[PDB]
Amino acid sequence: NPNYCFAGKTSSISDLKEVPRKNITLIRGLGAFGEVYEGQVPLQVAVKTLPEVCSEQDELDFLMEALIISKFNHQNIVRCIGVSLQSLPRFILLELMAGGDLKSFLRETRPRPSSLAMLDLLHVARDIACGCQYLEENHFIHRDIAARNCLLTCPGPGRVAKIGDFGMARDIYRMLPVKWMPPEAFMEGIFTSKTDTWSFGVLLWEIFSLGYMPYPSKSNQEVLEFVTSGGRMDPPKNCPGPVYRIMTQCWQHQPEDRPNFAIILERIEYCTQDPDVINTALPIE
Numbered sequence: 001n002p003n004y005c006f007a008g009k010t011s012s013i014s015d016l017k018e019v020p021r022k023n024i025t026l027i028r029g030l031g032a033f034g035e036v037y038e039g040q041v042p043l044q045v046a047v048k049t050l051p052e053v054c055s056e057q058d059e060l061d062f063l064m065e066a067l068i069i070s071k072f073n074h075q076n077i078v079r080c081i082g083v084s085l086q087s088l089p090r091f092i093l094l095e096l097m098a099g100g101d102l103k104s105f106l107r108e109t110r111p112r113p114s115s116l117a118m119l120d121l122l123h124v125a126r127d128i129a130c131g132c133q134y135l136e137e138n139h140f141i142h143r144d145i146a147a148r149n150c151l152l153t154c155p156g157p158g159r160v161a162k163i164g165d166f167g168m169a170r171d172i173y174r175m176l177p178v179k180w181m182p183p184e185a186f187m188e189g190i191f192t193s194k195t196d197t198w199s200f201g202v203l204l205w206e207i208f209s210l211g212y213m214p215y216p217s218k219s220n221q222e223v224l225e226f227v228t229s230g231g232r233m234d235p236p237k238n239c240p241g242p243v244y245r246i247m248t249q250c251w252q253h254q255p256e257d258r259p260n261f262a263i264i265l266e267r268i269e270y271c272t273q274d275p276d277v278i279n280t281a282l283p284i285e
């Protein structure tokens with residue numbers, strides 16, 4: 001059985017809490033390689049399934065993501081409730097995030113011409129940055145920080161954003177998101193904590209653009225050449241200067257010139273304190 005190392009000692013498949021299949025009930029689909037369901041164990045859960053028709057490498061990938069998520073302990077990273085691996089199809093059981101993924105939420109919750117404010121966006125940003133800081137200080141590199149991989153606890157004002165998907169980190173541990181990647185990453189395949197800083201800047205743009213695809217109207221190859229030549233995205237519509245400034249710092253060409261997540265968090269905090277930032281109106285389509 002596969003071994004995993006994080007924050008120190010090794011984890012084993014046996015360390016995962018196996019939940020008896022009889023205890024698990026699927027309620028509804030929630031929408032990649034495999035399905036996701038709302039489920040009950042009563043404890044309400046999200047159930048990630050492995051296709052019975054998969055390769056042996058698929059099997060290990062699935063097991064590896066369970067190990068990875070199960071070893072984190074932070075409020076801004078989605079909890080793993082357990083697994084059901086001794087029956088087919090195999091399940092990973094996650095904390096149910098009723099708000100859904102962040103990209104869909106932003107697109108569905110955009111201010112209507114007939115609600116959401118700057119402070120709400122800043123709190124999402126802060127939530128994920130806190131998650132990233134935790135990963136950084138535990139020397140884990142996510143490799144794919146993006147709005148599609150973040151989840152929300154609920155739609156309303158009490159929402160908490162968390163990092164939810166670790167498929168890219170899992171793959172590399174043993175289709176590329178080049179629009180989220182720094183030059184040294186897509187050119188050299190070099191990944192560090194500063195890799196995630198760059199990607200967080202792109203996530204910030206996603207958040208304050210309210211769910212636009214990065215580098216609108218550009219293809220992957222065009223972005224590659226654009227970014228390699230020093231090109232950077234313009235501010236999202238109505239974006240406050242202090243927020244754009246965080247983005248452009250995250251996108252410094254040299255990794256050593258980019259902020260670590262402690263610094264990012266401080267600057268996000270300073271933004272939430274600035275009335276000229278949070279009183280700024282979001283654009284309405």
Ligand SMILES: C[C@@H](Oc1cc(-c2cnn(C3CCNCC3)c2)cnc1N)c1c(Cl)ccc(F)c1Cl
Pocket residue numbers: 030031036046048078094095096097098099100101148149150151163164165
């Ligand atoms: C694996 C899957 O897990 C969940 C999906 C969801 C989810 C997706 N969509 N929805 C909708 C349910 C109906 N109301 C709107 C959100 C909830 C909630 N919690 C999860 N743990 C998931 C998905 Cl599908 C997308 C991004 C992620 F980062 C993750 Cl981790």
